[PDB]
């Protein structure tokens with residue numbers, strides 16, 4: 001059971017049914033996803049030489065889908081590829097960079113031809129450090145390892161901040177590159193944004209920037225662990241594309257497919273409900289127009 005597609009003209013009713021009896025059928029469906037992917041090993045991530053490279057020693061990339069850095073255990077970063085419907089490597093999911101792994105993070109962005117980064121955590125959340133401030137504080141260039149980075153703009157909007165960076169690393173396919181960074185600043189850990197409208201607009205906005213680019217590379221998405229908030233963002237991106245393309249939508253299949261590639265993408269039942277509320281809301285709006 002890989003997939004549960006719902007005809008869009010039947011979604012409103014499907015979701016009502018799932019929501020009946022205090023989410024009885026919603027919870028049953030959600031729990032069917034619990035073990036997807038969990039047959040897979042993270043032996044490289046567990047090597048003692050890699051210990052300090054993991055923010056959370058229990059949140060590790062599967063061997064089968066991990067992102068590898070060029071050799072300098074020098075290859076290791078806590079990050080995982082997510083293939084697309086049409087081609088490999090549509091997303092890279094990663095943890096919030098650590099002070100000691102930020103050079104590795106930027107190496108990865110450089111080597112993987114990444115032009116867009118989506119961050120859906122704050123650096124400190126309820127007194128706990130969740131992510132290093134791994135980008136410059138101002139417009140003065142700085143080295144991260146053998147990569148030079150310079151912030152060209154920082155635009156603080158109501159619910160996200162967009163930064164543009166120029167980066168140069170060890171030359172392969174390119175020698176210098178503009179990167180955009182999308183930092184969504186209103187998503188509580190273990191929770192959901194306060195409205196569907198907010199994250200739907202964020203996803204649409206990011207996908208807009210992606211789609212308009214002559215060549216985007218994999219999009220890097222991270223929160224603190226690269227699990228709950230990253231999983232929910234990516235799922236919504238996929239499901240929104242489904243609604244713009246097809247007459248059915250498959251939230252269960254989207255989450256299923258993410259979990260094949262990194263541990264338990266989408267952390268909570270509430271996050272699963274929120275994806276359904278998003279789809280419900282888009283469809284209601286569209287029906288009237």
Ligand SMILES: CNC(=O)[C@H](Cc1ccc(NS(=O)(=O)O)cc1)NC(=O)[C@H](Cc1ccc(O)cc1)NC(=O)OC(C)(C)C
Nearest residue numbers: 056059121189190223224225226227228229230263264267
């Ligand atoms: C200090 N360590 C931690 O907090 C770790 C790692 C972690 C995971 C997910 C997130 N959220 S995020 O991925 O959105 O950044 C942050 C941190 N947390 C966990 O492992 C949490 C622990 C937890 C918290 C609350 C709850 O009700 C049940 C279980 N477990 C957990 O996320 O389990 C998965 C990996 C199977 C999804």
